Amino acid sequence: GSDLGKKLLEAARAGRDDEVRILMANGADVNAADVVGWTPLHLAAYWGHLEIVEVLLKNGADVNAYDTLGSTPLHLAAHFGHLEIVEVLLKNGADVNAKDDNGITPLHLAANRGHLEIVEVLLKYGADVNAQDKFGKTAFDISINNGNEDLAEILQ
């Protein structure tokens, strides 16, 4: 990578909007990835930094960038209950049916943590409700196992 690529990964994670702003002006690599394959957008999505997610996507960040285990920023945002970021990523063309190495989708992760608003947004953008993981489990199979009767009704 590069020196500024490291500072952007740190700034994006930390939630330092002003530092990200200056780094985007100076031309810090938006596609800079750490050893596990996490871009600044991965980190911003994980820690729930909405403005940085939007600024990175404006500066040509790969919305469908995946780590060394095949997980995308939408996977992270959907799993940790960041509703606004999930909407932004999906508007900027995030693959709603993105499968990691385990066959897990953003819908599976949202269903597992009982993020009802996010599950509805994924279904609104055409989330495959019948999509199975490596163990042949759907988002509905997770809801009945978790005992989330509200979520199970949405997924029908």
Partner: protein, 1033 residues
């Protein structure tokens, strides 16, 4: 009492002899160390959970132990760390004065009953309870120069052949091995295990069965059949002793009849218990021993005994093995004693020369030469009675008291010589009268100096214990100085001195002394004429006094505050911190570059570099390291350019160019536990189960606010580590049950392979040592290797890990901190230039009060000390001033006259402040104790002036000015003699640039500057004070 001993000089001699014998005995038997025990008693609980993450360690070990640390006496606070190396360290800090043995056994007893609650793996490893100590006597490095041994090989040799013998050496307390004894390492192969349908579970099962001590019984044991002839013990299975035996451990017998041994599925060798640390000495593999001095032991005798034992181990060393001494404090302590003994001897010689310059008879010069050693020796007997040691603080405590000791000797003798010269009285009658003038004052002085120094002993915490060393040393020496002045010195004067004819001031002599006596008698008239002029216009000198008092107050506020000055001790540390996730190999490359620098660009200064990969200041891990630098002899490093400070600044500047690493050198502190003056130690606490992430957010919020106040706060950072990406793997319970695969077999296979498992013990050459099973490195490096590990199902099918597992990347803590049983995050920082520690702390409290709900805080360590130390000061200053006043009031029989003495304080303080400010030194303890001794001697000079003046007015019925002029005339010579001797006595300390010069400069500079002004101003100002006070009241 002086009258009693004037008529009884043999009795006076008997007392002096008894004092010298007691002191002579004390010198031989007194303990010797660099510094005494300063820090409050602390007990550390250490446990190891092999292959455990920070949260696993915290939630199974740390929290369980913390919840059970109840019903223990005199606990101040409890703090702990749980990191990803599988290590937990809980530190329990106790009240100053607590019995450290009782503290340890109480902690240890509460742990014992909490052991059944801990994981069986942690119970197997053990949980060490030790008394926390940072101060090493010396570090013995053990290296191999011919490259025939690894660090593991050397560590095993030291543990087996050296460590125990060093632990038994005279004066040796504790010995720490920098490494471990051998462990039987079974490096498993997953391809070979799967091939024979075996797992790590089978390897552990087989080792436990085939490496064990089995109890059998006895032939013809009781109760026997009567007529039995033989009774013998039955020996069955005993532990395995070699790699060969472990390789022949039977795992499986195949259908055809072929045997699967442990050597078929694993690589077997004697290796290290763990591989986290890589130690190198100038690039070569190294182990070592960290040796601590035993309680009440002699550092110099112990270091000599350690080297004597290592010397007779030399012949039995393997080829290439060499002993090196990267750290040893005794050469520094050797110099400290020599330089202090030198100062005391030179001081006695300087007094002899001054005594002869003025009095000009060899009989007079003998009385101080006898008296001062008698006081010094007596002081040692009193230190021994108090249970003190010969250490840096107590040694410099006696150097600072030289001025007071010397004055007692001069004042008594000089006053007899004058009385004989002025009246023509014979020595004995002259001595009786001379003592009659001063004996009441000398006692008054003893009480005034007691009032000054004794309260300094009653400060709490670390700094209080340091001040207590100087306090008892000075008070003891001062107390014995006055007893010797009231008993021995008068008896010596009366019996040894030669009579002087009335009016003989030596003006009729020829040569140097004829000239000098005429010069000084003329100078005394110039002085009294000058005081006469001053006392006609006191108003303008009262104004000049307020300029001095204001100038003093101004310089006090401006002078930067410190604890103890940093010394060139022939060593300094270099920190190496790489970013998160950085491997052991990457850290070694930075360390190799750091070492290569010191041996190339500082080859004339540096002797060796001790590079330790896997250990930082506070943290551990693969991305942390430290390079302990050892310098050549002080003599080979001339000038400031080749000193630790110059080298430090040179190295730190050179290493700022290094990429993907934070590297810098720095000098060791005098005492590590003090920290930094202006430095604070802050704890941010989770008070309502908010969790790790929310306390992190609250920390970031506080750190950001602290950054907006650079005028008040500087370098406000976390002491801990940041969250790192960690490999979360979920076992599918349904899939495991569906395939007939047990979860115990899964978690054992994963844990044993990737983390390592301590199975049981074996006996290597008559020494019990551990057996570890772990994956051969190459099969436990990357996530793809997870699938290569197979677990046997109930039906006999080998199932890969991928079939029943799913993984993802997440962030978690590699080091979780707790404070008083609650989740915490330690924040270090310091007050900005010009700002006090107190102001910086008050802002941090103000910033802390604006943090989210359920986020509290607390002050720990030096900050906890600083608060409880600062709350006492006002009371201890008040008591000192009040008792000084009351003592002077009893002496002079006056509520007003005492003010004329107490007004002298600033005259000595301004000179100390000017000298310290000019030379660019700090307000350290040596300077502060220097002020009290400077204030003490000037106060004594004023007391004798005011006593002589008051007595002249009372007895001879003289006027205020007449008495004042006649007093200061009589007191001029003795004041100049003491000042001339003492200022020359501390001149070597000021100009010193050698080893231990930092402390010598701090003691010398402030005292010399203070004495110059105290002497010059007081002789002119004490006359003014007395007249002004007497006129007013």
């Amino acid at each position: 009492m002086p009258n009693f001993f004037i008529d009884r000089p043999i009795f006076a001699w008997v007392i002096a002899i008894i004092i010298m014998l007691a002191g002579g005995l004390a010198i031989l038997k007194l303990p010797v160390a660099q510094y005494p025990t300063i820090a409050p008693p602390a007990v550390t609980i250490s446990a190891s959970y092999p292959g455990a993450d920070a949260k696993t360690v915290q939630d199974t070990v740390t929290q369980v132990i913390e919840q059970n640390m109840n019903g223990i006496d005199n606990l101040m606070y409890m703090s702990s760390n749980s990191d990803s190396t599988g290590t937990v360290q809980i530190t329990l800090t106790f009240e100053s004065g607590t019995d450290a043995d009782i503290a340890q056994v109480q902690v240890q007893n509460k742990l014992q009953l909490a052991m059944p609650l801990l994981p069986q793996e942690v119970q197997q490893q053990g949980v060490s309870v030790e008394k926390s100590s940072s101060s090493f006597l010396m570090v013995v490095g053990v290296i191999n120069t011919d490259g025939t041994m690894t660090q593991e090989d050397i560590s095993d040799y030291v543990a087996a052949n050296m460590k125990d013998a060093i632990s038994r050496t005279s004066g040796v307390g504790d010995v720490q091995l920098f490494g471990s004894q051998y462990a039987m390492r079974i490096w498993m192969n997953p391809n070979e295990l799967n091939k024979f349908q075996l797992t790590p579970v089978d390897v552990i099962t087989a080792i436990k069965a085939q490496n064990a001590q089995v109890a059998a019984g006895q032939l013809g044991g009781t109760p026997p059949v009567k007529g039995q002839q033989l009774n013998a013990s039955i020996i069955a299975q005993t532990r395995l002793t070699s790699t060969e035996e472990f390789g022949k451990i039977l795992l499986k017998v195949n259908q055809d009849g072929s045997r699967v041994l442990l050597r078929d599925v694993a690589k077997i060798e004697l290796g290290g218990e763990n591989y986290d640390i890589i130690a190198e000495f100038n690039g070569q593999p190294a182990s070592g021993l960290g040796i601590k001095l035993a309680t009440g032991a002699n550092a110099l005798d112990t270091a000599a005994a350690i080297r004597a034992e290592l010397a007779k181990m030399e012949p039995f060393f393997p080829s290439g093995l060499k002993i090196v001494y990267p750290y040893d404090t005794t050469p520094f302590v050797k110099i400290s004693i020599h330089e202090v003994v030198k100062t005391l001897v030179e001081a006695i010689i300087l007094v002899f020369l001054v005594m002869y310059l003025f009095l000009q008879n060899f009989r007079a010069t003998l009385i101080p030469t006898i008296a001062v050693p008698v006081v010094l020796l007596g002081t040692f007997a009193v230190l021994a009675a108090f249970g003190f040691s010969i250490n840096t603080l107590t040694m410099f405590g006696m150097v600072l008291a030289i001025g007071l000791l010397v004055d007692d000797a001069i004042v008594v003798v000089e006053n007899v010589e004058r009385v004989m010269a002025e009246e023509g009285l014979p020595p004995k009658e002259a001595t009786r009268k001379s003592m009659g003038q001063i004996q009441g004052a000398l006692v008054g002085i003893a009480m005034v100096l007691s009032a000054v120094f004794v309260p300094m002993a009653f400060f709490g915490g670390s700094t209080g214990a340091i001040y207590r060393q100087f306090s008892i040393t000075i008070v003891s020496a001062m107390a014995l100085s006055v007893l010797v002045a009231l008993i021995l010195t008068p008896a010596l004067c009366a019996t040894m001195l030669k009579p002087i004819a009335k009016g003989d001031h030596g003006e009729g002599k020829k040569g140097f002394f004829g000239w000098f006596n005429r010069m000084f008698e003329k100078s005394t008239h110039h002085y009294t004429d000058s005081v006469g002029g001053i006392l006609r216009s006191t108003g303008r000198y009262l104004v000049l006094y307020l300029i001095i008092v204001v100038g003093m107050a101004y310089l006090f506020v401006r002078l930067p505050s410190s604890f103890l000055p940093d010394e060139d001790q022939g060593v300094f540390m270099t920190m190496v911190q790489l970013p998160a996730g950085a491997t052991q190999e990457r850290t070694q490359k930075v360390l190799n570059e750091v070492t290569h620098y010191y041996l190339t660009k500082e080859k004339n200064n540096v002797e060796s570099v001790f590079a330790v990969n896997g250990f930082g200041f506070a943290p551990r891990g693969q991305n942390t390291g430290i390079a302990f630098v050892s310098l050549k002899d002080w003599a080979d490093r001339p000038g400031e350019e080749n000193k630790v400070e110059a080298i430090t600044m040179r190295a730190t500047r050179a290493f700022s160019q290094i990429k993907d690493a934070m590297v810098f050198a720095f000098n060791l502190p005098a005492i590590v536990e003090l920290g930094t003056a202006t430095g604070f130690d802050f704890e941010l606490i989770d008070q309502a189960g908010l969790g790790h992430e929310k306390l992190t957010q609250a920390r970031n919020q506080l750190l950001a606010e602290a950054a907006k106040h650079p005028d008040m706060l500087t370098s406000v950072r976390p002491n801990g580590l940041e969250d790192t990406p960690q490999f979360k793997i979920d076992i599918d319970q349904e899939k495991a049950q569906a395939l007939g695969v047990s979860i115990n077999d899964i978690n054992t296979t994963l844990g044993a392979a990737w983390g390592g498992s301590y199975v049981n013990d074996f006996i290597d050459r008559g020494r019990v040592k551990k057996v570890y099973v772990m994956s051969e490195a190459k099969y436990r490096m990357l996530p793809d290797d997870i699938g290569d590990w197979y677990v046997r199902a109930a039906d006999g099918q080998m199932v890969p890990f991928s079939a029943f597992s799913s993984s993802r990347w997440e962030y978690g803590s590699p080091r979780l901190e707790r404070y008083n049983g609650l989740p915490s995050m330690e924040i270090l920082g310091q007050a900005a230039p010009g700002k006090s520690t107190g102001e910086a702390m008050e802002l941090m409290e103000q910033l802390a009060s604006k943090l989210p709900t359920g986020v509290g805080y607390d002050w720990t360590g030096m900050s906890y000390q600083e608060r409880l130390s600062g709350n006492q000061a006002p009371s201890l200053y008040a008591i000192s001033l009040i008792v000084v006043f009351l003592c002077l009031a009893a002496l002079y029989e006056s509520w007003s006259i005492p003010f004329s003495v107490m007004l002298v304080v600033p005259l000595g303080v301004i000179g100390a402040l000017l000298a310290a400010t000019f030379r660019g030194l700090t307000n350290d303890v040596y300077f502060q104790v220097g002020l009290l001794t400077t204030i003490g001697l000037s106060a004594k000079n004023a007391i004798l002036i005011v006593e002589f003046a008051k007595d002249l007015m009372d007895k001879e019925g003289k006027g205020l000015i007449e008495a004042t002029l006649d007093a200061v005339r009589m007191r001029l010579r003795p004041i100049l003699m003491t000042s001339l001797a003492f200022i020359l006595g501390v001149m070597p300390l000021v100009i010193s640039t050698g080893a231990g010069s930092g402390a010598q400069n701090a003691v010398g500079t402030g005292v010399m500057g203070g004495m110059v002004t105290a002497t010059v101003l007081a002789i002119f100002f004490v006359p003014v004070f007395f007249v002004v006070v007497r006129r007013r009241f």
